[PDB]
Amino acid sequence: LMGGFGLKHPPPQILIKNTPVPADPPTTFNQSKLNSFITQYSTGQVSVEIEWELQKENSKRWNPEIQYTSNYYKSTSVDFAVNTEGVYSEPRPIGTRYLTRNL
């Protein structure tokens, strides 16, 4: 209902955690689980490649259609670009329904 593709077997969930690394344990055995750990965090890169199948438009319409276009008028800052502080922002929500087709 929120849009998208309903899948019975969607991309699985990739779960990840940092393996615990205990701090120096007592020098005498204590049955209690170790609660002291070395503080750490991990970083790194992640890539995600998706192949999409398209269905090209074969419109035999005569007059021009409605395309999504960045309005030609001059602005302070380009749309879908970083401002003067390096903060990227998407100004409006873009849908897909632009091209028309008969019913």
Add this chain to the structure above:
Amino acid sequence: LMGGFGLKHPPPQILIKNTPVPADPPTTFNQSKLNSFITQYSTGQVSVEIEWELQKENSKRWNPEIQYTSNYYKSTSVDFAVNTEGVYSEPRPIGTRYLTRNL
């Protein structure tokens, strides 16, 4: 200077005329060329197929470009369509320079 492709050997000129068909000549020889003709005109269809080579756009730009689009607002009559009397009209002159590229 008016735009287009300058060609040294452009598509040739296809010339066409109706061959003359003289009206009934005198029954006695007159050296003068016949000036009386049967009034006629010809009609028919003509096709012209042209193959154009394209150069697809490979823009690696991030934000959206400026596309030519039929304005979404409601009008009395569709643009580039026939009016209520069957008269086709092109409302504005459309150029090609829409997509941008670096210098």
